Structures are given as structure tokens and as C-alpha cells.
């Protein structure tokens, strides 16, 4: 070889040293959001029991029989709230991935003639406590669909 080959080798080493990386931030965000999903999954029992025994959805945390919103906290979850039958979880503002800072996701259920189905995805709000009221969509501090698992990507019109 000659000096040209050595210079080419050095240039190739420099090229390999600085290369672009894929978006692992989305994967880390999904891993962190899984914790909030698990935390919100544990409040289904009280809501279901209240609906079955009273015939209408619970109004707030106190009526359902769970702790206050500011007390249901985890490593990456700030608060979990129940309002008219929907469970919304809000992330924290520090020591959390930048893409899911201050975002929310919601869980809600619909009653059928022989089963009760549960949905998970973007934030959703209900108007009153009636058992047949539909669910609208909320557009305040909404999480992005790229930070959620493929299973938890439901819409407000799902039935
Ligand atoms: C239990 O949840 C109920 C929906 C709520 N009731 C009402 O808001 C209306 O009275 C329904 O006609 C209760 O206030 C809740 N109980 C509490 C907060 O202790
Ligand atoms: O936890 P809670 O349902 O009391 O709500 C906390 C929040 O500050 C009120 O929106």
C-alpha cells in the first residue's frame, strides 16, 4: 500500500466515528408510558363495581372509593384522576423523557348487552354520569401516537 490507502482508512474511521442514530427516544418514551398504563389499569375495579351496584358512573375519586389524584404517584406519573368514568394519567415535568413531558392518556369503558369493553388511547371526556352518554375528545396536553403501543391507540369513535 501507500500513504493514500492510510489516509483513506483514517477518513473511513472518522466517518464511522460520527454516524446518525435512530430514534430510541420513542422506545424509551413507550417504556416509560407503560408504567402509567399499569398504574391506571388498577383503578378499573372500583369504577366497575360502582357502576354495577349504582347504575351510574362515579363522579370523582371520592365517590369511586380511591385516593386523591395527587396521591396516586409513581416514578414517572404525577397524578391519576377519575371524572365521570374516565381514568386520565398525567406525566411529570422533570427527570422524564422530553417527548412525554406533561402529556396525558385516558381509559374508558362502554357497556354492551353481554359484556363490558375497555378502551385505551388519547384523552377523552364525558359530559354527565348517565350510562348511555357517548364520549367526546379532549384537545389539551395530548400525548403523541408514536409514544404508545400499537394496542393502546384507540379513538373516541371506537365502539
Ligand atoms: C358519587 O358519584 C356520584 C355520581 C355523585 N352524585 C352526583 O353527582 C349526583 O348527586 C348524582 O345525581 C356523588 O356526589 C358521589 N359521591 C361523593 C362525591 O361522595
Ligand atoms: O387528584 P385530584 O382529582 O384531586 O386533581 C388534582 C388536580 O390538581 C385537579 O385538577
Author numbering: 1 to 159
Give the article text.
Typically, the type IV pili are helical polymers constituted of one protein component, the major pilin. Type IV pili not only serve as multifunctional organelles allowing the adherence to host cells and the auto-aggregation of these bacteria, but also play an essential role in their pathogeneses. Molecular dynamics of the whole pilus with GATDH and G3P for a period of 1µs showed the overall stability of the structure. As previously described, the PilE monomer contains a 4 strand beta-sheet region, and an N-terminal melted alpha helix that forms the core of the type-IV pilus. Immune evasion against antibodies targeting type IV pili is thus attributed to the structural diversity present among strains, including variations in pilin sequence, sugar type, and phosphoform.
The structure of pili purified from the 8013 strain expressing the SA sequence type was determined in the same fashion to shed light on the impact of sequence variation on the pilus structure (center). Comparison of pili from strains expressing pilin of SA and SB sequence types reveals nearly identical backbone structures except in the C-terminal hypervariable loop. In this region, the SB structure shows a longer and more protrusive extension, mainly due to aminoacidic deletions in SA. Accordingly, molecular dynamics analysis of the SA pilin shows limited movement in the hypervariable region compared to the SB sequence type. Since mutations of charged amino acids in this area of the SB sequence caused loss of bacterial aggregation, the global change of shape of this loop between the SA and SB sequence types is likely to affect the basis for pilus-pilus adhesion. Recombination-based amino acid changes had a strong impact on nanobody binding and neither F10 or C24 showed any binding to SA sequence type pili. Structures reveal that clashes come from amino acid differences located in beta sheet strand 1.
